[PDB]
């Protein structure tokens, strides 16, 4: 029957050792979970199966019924055959002509082996080799380039039947140079004597197919896992990313395009008049042979075999069929009558009465000669005297010459005075054909076709397919070859136009022959296939999106982005988690759901002309802003990378100019720019500021950001965690210059900046560091964000507790949320990937015979090897130039990020910035810099309103006819009394003359209310 | 999109970008900059404009005494904005320029397929059909070298243009944060005056 | 080799970058704010 | 196995024939040559890195 | 001669520009447009 292969049939692709790396290779492999044909030895059985590419043989048995295998083309003594057998002494591999039985086997007797019934005769024996449920045998047999490979594995397993669900890589155990084809495979079984009763065992056959497999190697080098790229879209995504585990996201893996279903050839809907020539009533005499010019016509030269009756034809150029492909400017048909025995003279190179004096073909003739007996038409009782032939002539005729003169031939020296007489002969003789002549003397009509090809259009030439509409087809319209779908068109083509061209030279439409209809050619549907996945860790469920594909080509949903299957469309909207496109994002309720994105929760503010919202309370929030400052200072050597340790390639490379100096200087420039970037961002302080040994900061705690002495690197817990979170080699021609500033030195710079901002506020950035108590510095920053300093002093304990809580939470968030340092990880990954691709391009041939320079130099002489070495040199030069350009662009992006980071350090750390959201969401209080590998993390401490209360509001207060406006803050009304408060904090105060200023009167200001302005001087 | 090219639709549609713009406009007219800072605090728009006047060093009273004049001037300027946009050609040129540059880049890239690059013909099918393998492969390689060089030049130019657009988008985001989400005291960052 | 794979990867990167640019420029509001039904803005007109 | 490869497509180890042992192949040392110079005016004495 | 032909919706050539007739025609041919906007355009190179 058929069993499930599960994950078996994987073998080591080669003797190459790999440790802890994923390797993708395309070889003959058994597909995962494929149907494998399994047979039971016992009958209540060894059929001959084909071999094809390869065979995976699985054996579940305890008494070793399966003793051997037989490979070959005919499996008999007629042809050489391969035989592997286990006779209980050793495995014997014999390539000889064996005559196997209809049921060859090894008969085991009572236990001892007694009978060997596998073969009866051994012939030629070209090759011979000898090598010395509860168990599982796995074997892979393949035959490639004359080498036969056996991969073996033993795995003890307890199972009733079928393959176990366990992954085992098959180690190659035998490799033999057999040299003979294998098209049939037969297994050998051990027959148990009772009449035979085979043991109860299961043997499984799985055919190898060309498959791409991603195999995961471990530190030992064993293949611990594998992925079949063609098994399903999730495995194809794993192969595309070169990783077994894929994170949540969209991934473009391959492209779907519809192949043409069938080919249609379209050609215009007059025939050459060959009937007028061969079936003419009268034919000319040979001396006056007739010539018919044929032109401007199409002819069916295939039927020459039946252009006339009882014909006899011979072509001296190519076959009559090939005449049908060919075209010619003119065809000539010469025709005449002669005797049967003279037809042999109508051939190139002949001499005789006819060839010499009547009709002469050239020695290089390439045409056709056709002749048929015309006795019934041209012979007459009494003699047909119409047909004549020239018997005398003073010289032979030149090819295709015609002579119709009738001058008396003067055979002697006397004149003939124009009359026949002695030695004065009329030059023509009649054949006088009579029906009773022998066939040699009967008349034959003859047609000679000559094919001229001069300098002009070939107007004489030698298919039409049914039109199909709205189907992807490969079409041929009068020599226009293309692929697409043909649909009805509304374009009014002018009568002389055959095909329509859309802008940028595209074949948009064509008028069809025999119908004159204009058909629009829409290119066959093609689009990438994207894979929606919530991540293999979360779920193996997968959705598929065909980009720009209508839902007509193989739950479904049609979107502007294309046809998406595997995800259910849901009307209600959610925040986007996976991007699809066209405003649609897609995992919920144990399934993938596709929805239109919801841009935000709807929040309408209750606007009123007299209503205000004042924050009665606030909160301190610390946010991280992570900015890359530099990339790895990579350096390539153009000479070594392109031309490896060889003088010959170096001499040719020198002919390409100063490319290697330009590329090296460009990389040197980016490396110097990286050093300058780090220096600009971090070295903004003239002096190194040191935090006081006593952390008396009025209750503020900076333990998470101040450097920790106990750690052996003067780094704070937060930056130490950042270093621990981000995770990161010697090549040929490639080096990584170390950064000018060490991580310890960069951390010391960050600590100095942090000490300076903690102790002197923003003064150290402006100039000399002036000590100021941290609560007083916080009060100045609060005054800077429009909140009176008394608010902090009245709430110093609350603010310090909030600050410490936020500082703890931010380290927790950095430690708990992945991809927080993803911006820094991305640049490291991009640099590493570019380096990896550049090294990988060394193994690309670029059209050369081999990628490795030594092989092409050793096997080819320098005069010919120079072109191959040039192909490799130009390919490597182009690759290095591309890598340098990618690095230059990436360095420009990194420099922009570093400039932003330097500006943010100058305006958010060295000072308090009033730019909104430049230093974190909310009113910016301060920032703390932290070092990170190739980056800086800014901890922005910001002030955010927490509790908001409504208040009735008046623009001005009317007192004794005068209008009073708040000097600072706004007027508020809790519902009984009016007060003056700062806008960013609810601290109501009685309306007085010291906090309000009088302007104009009450009859100009619109929307004001009456109240009493208490004058402090009055009481 | 007929020669192996594709134009992926933008993630945010025209209506959804308009909805984001409408939300920002409502936030500015209803809360001033408080919605950008955090929770939206309801503010009277004349009072919000009065504090914005206070932000540029002009006392709040001048707006209240001249509220009608300011409103008339603001409405007239907003009306003039439509006239300026609709009556000045090339006013939207800064966007049309990038759209045209992308279109020209695609047009040149697909016109480069018509190029021979020294091969006997630009069309791959005819040269493959009419040439034997050991010279057809040389011609195909020459066309592939030319086409790949054209594609790489187009990709590099697109990357440079993308960097320029990335800088422009960063400036636009900074302008949205500083001018729209708040009030900017850096002169000429959000217009003259 | 993977020359065209590099080109396709770069083009995919620029497309994602355009998406990120639009998201960064326009999605600066956590919640969609709706204008009040009545336009009582003290004489200022926002109909345009 | 007969020879080992690195993470990249480069050979890190080989199984030496004639002894059946494992030999690590390290790319033999190479590097750039830089010259520390205070300037022709200051001094002609230079150092080689 | 090089001619810039304006094919209408019907495919009929409704107008043409002789690229060598005059510098304005050279500008029209270089711009690949029948109407050139205000400005300076580089059409060809003069050499002795
Ligand atoms: C506050 C006010 O007067 N609003 C009006 C508005 O209703 C009208 O649509 C617009 C016409 O452009 O003129 C203004
Ligand atoms: C082509 O010939 C067919 C019959 O052979 C006829 O039906 C059709 O109208 C012809 N088309 C032309 C002449 O365009
Ligand atoms: C998978 O995700 C869960 C949370 O969804 C997490 O706890 C777990 O560590 C993740 N495992 C891996 C291997 O990523
Ligand atoms: C896509 O397919 C649907 C269903 O067959 C059809 O209604 C629709 O018009 C098609 N769209 C296009 C552009 O062909
Ligand atoms: C303000 O909020 C903080 C944190 O929510 C709280 O601890 C504090 O008691 C609040 N103060 C007032 C006056 O409501
Ligand atoms: C700051 O918090 C840390 C948390 O472990 C604590 O050990 C330290 O004592 C705190 N510092 C002060 C000054 O309270
Ligand atoms: C409003 O404020 C007044 C004066 O401080 C106070 O007496 C009164 O209880 C408050 N009323 C309300 C509704 O809060
Ligand atoms: C606000 O509008 C109401 C009408 O809804 C009006 O009665 C009141 O006087 C207005 N107040 C102000 C301050 O404009
Ligand atoms: C060298 O140094 C001297 C004095 O320090 C200075 O005048 C001169 O310009 C420098 N350069 C050269 C090339 O002499």
Numbering used by the authors:
A (entry chain A): 27 to 70, 80 to 145, 152 to 173, 186 to 247, 257 to 331, 334 to 526, 529 to 620, 641 to 672, ...
B (entry chain C): 854 to 1046
C (entry chain C): 757 to 804
D (entry chain B): 563 to 611
E (entry chain C): 273 to 320
Can you list sentences taken from the study reporting this PDB entry?
The spike protein of the SARS-CoV-2 binds to human angiotensin-converting enzyme 2 (ACE2) through the receptor-binding domain (RBD) and changes the conformation to fuse the viral and cell membranes, mediating viral entry. Here, we used a structure-guided strategy to engineer an inhibitor peptide with mutation-tolerant and potent binding ability against all SARS-CoV-2 variants. We named the peptide CeSPIACE (COVID-19 eliminative Short-Peptide Inhibiting ACE2 binding). For engineering, we determined approximately 2 Å-resolution crystal structures of CeSPIACE or its intermediate-stage peptides complexed with the RBDs of several strains, including WT, Alpha, Delta, BA.2, BA.5, or XBB.1.5.
We determined the cryo-EM structures of CeSPIACE complexed with spike ectodomain trimers whose RBDs were BA.2 or BA.5-type. The EM map showed that CeSPIACE binds to each RBD of the trimer, forcing three RBDs into an open conformation, although in the prefusion state, the trimer is predominantly in a single RBD open conformation. Two spike trimers formed a head-to-head complex mediated by CeSPIACE involving several docking modes. Another docking complex was observed in the BA.5-type spike, in which two spike trimers docked via seven peptides at three sites. Most particles consisted of the docking complex linked at all three sites, suggesting that triple-linked complexes are more stable than single- or double-linked complexes, which have wobbly sites. The crystal structures and peak retention time in gel filtration indicated that CeSPIACE certainly dimerized in physiologic solutions, but the cryo-EM structures suggested that CeSPIACE has stacking properties that allow it to dock two spikes. The stacking number of CeSPIACE varied, but relatively numerous peptides may render sufficient flexibility to dock two spike trimers distorted by the potent binding with CeSPIACE. Head-to-head complexes similar to the cryo-EM structures would form on the viral envelope, implying that CeSPIACE can bridge separate spikes to aggregate viral particles.
